């Protein structure tokens, strides 16, 4: 399901063959909008757990005095407004795969109790004693330099090589400028065949999207096509139907 | 309903006719005051969703700790209080037009929640394991910086581009006054045929009031005829008759 | 368990063996993943608190506000949240082993009150007048300069000599190159008895990475066997199967 | 409990007697390790205030925002936090001793607060109106010039002369070695008292001692008989069982 | 309560008698230990105040970012910290004196907000819009050269101006030296008074004592007094009896 | 309210007349103490501004990295501290007059911002988006250089001629001492309205003032007054009832 001749969408081809049978860990790194969760998903129903369950983590979004019991579970009464006994996303993804969404964005604190979880192999629900076994692959992203966050102390070094045993990098549209011709084909198959809208780019068009910087990538790109769907129904999209911040000759 | 003869009002007609018998999202940015929640209320009766329910959410009022179940409903004992099972704002929408009032105002947890909504168009009610389906049409309505959020990391980039495949930005009273005259005769209209008072303004007032930098756009001017017609009933109205603050003349 | 050759791992192993069954505080000094907790852990294995337990506090992960509670317990109402009473990292390591991990990165008023247990050698739950025993071997571990810490004031140079009476240095990998080839051979044997993958390196390939300077020192070679049993499974690693950053000839 | 024979402490243990059964302030100056605390609480014990509490502050460990919380006791909902009424040191100390460690740490608001507490007699909880009787004896201590702080207005000049009414000062162990071998006597006997170990020293090993700088004073001594009851357990310590650092000959 | 013969206590006891019952705003000038607080209280119990509250400020104690709410008193919300709403130390002193406390160390954002304060006599809290009148006499007092801080422009002309309308300067101790026998008088009679001991000086000692340069001036005169009532109990000072650096023969 | 007969301050009259009613940038320009601040609330009490706020900006008190929030206002969380959203100075003077005290002690950062809100007559807040009009008439003040300010590079010269439309020089009170006796006319009644003392001078008095050099000018003179209604309360102050700085005979 990607799309591409680009020297680097070959590769990560490439790469996601080689661990997606494993139960390794892998990191997907790239800008938002880089596929990075098309990735996740594409692997986890290429691997060994593709008739398990696929749980998503997004860990910058989860309050941080609830993360805890987001991932680990809780027993009734372990803290104000537990009033029922859950299971977290650690139990949820037993057999299957857990995938931490931005990473760098999950707090120190939880950052030691995954390590621990990943070590060891087993978790406690919060407010629990029961020691319960673990089964999940690790899938993980980030649009973050983790690098970066070890020196300055906002990420832990033990977890990164963990987690990074097998990284897959996504690069950026604006450095595959290639691909957007066939980016664009598919994103219109798939507005076709959910009947939600036609319309096809000239090469001049097709030309200046290649000179656009895409800050938002491939998310971006396909944004536009919705958007050219509803100002130009079933029409051939041309220089001047693009938006003017889309406009790029000479 | 839409009063005036601006550039900007008349793009604005133009646009709305564009969008509002698709289904597509759209996202209207616009200062406090500028008619976005008459725009969308506008765009669902021109829809495919205009014999069903137009249903608002008020993303900034509701406490963060329940706006979950506010969205998705709950059932019976899912939280403290929850001794009844109840329909959410999303079921309750359902074959119709969810409107999402200052969606900048939505927590981080269910910007992500809601955007698996808008992916999945599945939903789980709070405490239930029952995956029920949704098709609403999505309008949404801002005044903040929605981009600048991204950058601060309290706004996701992946449901800005699912909620902004059309924008609609309404221009400030102050930016276009040459339409005030014609506001101000709609508004008059409207009091009148309500029994609530009459007034109206002579040239020189009118010319006063296009000077105004209007905080409050057209919601500030709909509240100084109100307060006009209690001045001055039946009055004619002149400079003289007008608050200070509004007298701008020289 | 600590694999190798050279002097300096000789040296370790014998200062491991002259203080594990005191119960005398053990800091154990040395870069990020230069194998510190896997000595911390076998001390405690090999010391009087064999049969009890082995309890992590990580110092710079846990919230400054809340490693009080942490480390020393609370009472029920103690704080906000406090809605149990629960006993602490001290009370859990009674009779057993506190490992210290990262004490550089302990707050200054967690430091004082540390060192006040480690004299009295009691200790109250926060919120609580009950004054409890506690009877703990100490380890503790860092990769920072705590001299120069004293110097800024950022550590504690009563609480440094309390802990610092047998002092443990690990070197880095890059200065003890020649164990490479008896790691490796652990590393693949841990992950082959785990039928995780299987590899060997050729001599070629052993140059090259005694030529790395190991940033991530031993935890970054594990995480390169890792890598490489997926990229080349069952294979023979010479220079040209090395990621290119491991590659040094000449 | 202040042993050796040199002048220094001579002139100390006659100071102490002096002042120890008045109920003036005490201001002990020193460096680090030389014995400060231990003046402070023998003093205590050989006071009017002997029967009651003596209570410890350490003035630059506690953050700066929560000092005056910490010395003075707080109100229910004085900040944020405060769910509770607590006394504070003070109040603790009453009837008592206050000891103030390393006062050149306090922050200025706090040290004029202090003084009025000093000066009235009386203080008030954090949040309160209720002002409460205090009667503490001052004992503080610090390793700073207090007078170049009064010069660059970092340390409060009329705090320091109601502080200073009686001034201890501790010579660092360098300037007096001739008691290294009874304090050595005193360090042992403690150690094998308690049976955490027993070593004795030989006269070579005692004079290389003697040349040694003690950048950490008594407290660094004691360490070192620590390690060396680890190194050479029931060993007769020579010149050559020190470490390298502590061998001084010729 | 100010003891003396020399013409400098004199001038200062006529013009405290000139100026007391005026409302005028009074500048107390003088090295520490000089007794400005002394004045200042005393003041202001011969003064129409004398019934009210006499409420110091410490200008260079309390910091800066927290000096606005200190003075001015905050409402609930206005800053970080601020959950409830508290009157300052102006509404405090309200029909009473305030006294500013080396007036020297306001800085320049509060000196002129106190200027306007002293203007218009109305304040706001901060965070709030209400008005609110004060009424209360002003003493000020400072050690430092203002009208060096004027020409380099760390103290305001126009509140210079305003504040000092009427100056009191206080001759450092080494400079009336012939009270001191006046002031040892009072401060022995104080101290025996309080039953906190019992010393006399013959006039050997208090020759030597009228040698000395007092950087602490009268305060540092009181420490001896309080020093020396430790050290020779119930004892007759002579020069021998004084600490070395008091012994001033030839 | 401006008195005297010298040709200077009738010059400075007629100067007020000619530019008060007009919207017009004024620059006072003059020494401490010259009345520069009662010139401009004149000009503002007799402009087309007369009935809308006057807003004083004390630009060398306002810490430099607070300036902007200051004039320009703030949105929550522009800068840490910013919890709230405030209307700046500039916002605070809509509709009425700016008043710039010392403008040449204004950071070069904000004269040039300063400058382009005086040329685009809009702003934004720190932090925001938002484009907002302004309507002030603005009048500034110095005691400044502004010409060698330009040349040092330290006041911007753009700026320079934007401000300094129509110039009123205030000339040093020792420049126009035969107004000293109409002054202190006005200065006594002033007083002596308010309760607050009476005085009056004889005529060799007021020659004696009149060669003084009053490096405070008219402000220096204001607090002379009030300190001889305390000295001599109800009496007439002749050249031994002045201070000896004050007396010039011969």
């Keep these: 399901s990607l799309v591409g001749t680009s020297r680097a969408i070959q590769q990560v081809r490439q790469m996601m063959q080689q661990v997606a049978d494993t139960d390794a860990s892998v990191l997907i790194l790239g800008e ?102 673990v089964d999940v692959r690790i899938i993980a992203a980030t649009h973050k330099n983790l690098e970066k966050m070890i020196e300055d102390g906002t990420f832990r070094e033990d977890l990164y090589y963990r987690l990074n045993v097998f990284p897959i990098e996504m690069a950026p549209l604006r450095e595959r400028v290639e691909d957007i011709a066939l980016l664009l084909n598919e994103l219109i198959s798939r507005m076709e065949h959910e009947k939600r809208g036609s319309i096809r780019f000239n090469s001049a068009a097709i030309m200046s999207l290649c000179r656009h910087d895409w800050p938002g990538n491939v998310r971006e790109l396909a944004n536009l096509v919705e958007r050219l769907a509803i100002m130009h129904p079933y029409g051939v999209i041309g220089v001047g139907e693009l938006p003017k911040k889309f406009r790029h000759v000479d």
């Design 32 to 133: 938002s909008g880089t596929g990075k969760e098309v990735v996740a998903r594409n692997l986890h129903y290429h691997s060994k757990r593709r008739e398990g369950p696929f749980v998503p983590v997004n860990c910058g979004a989860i309050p941080a005095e609830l993360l805890e019991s987001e991932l680990f579970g809780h027993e009734k009464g372990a803290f104000t407004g537990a009033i029922t006994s859950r299971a977290g996303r650690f139990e949820l993804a037993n057999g299957g795969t857990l995938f931490l969404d931005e990473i760098g964005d999950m707090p120190l604190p939880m950052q030691v109790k995954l390590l621990r979880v990943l070590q060891e192999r087993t978790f406690e629900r919060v407010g629990s004693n029961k020691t319960q076994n």
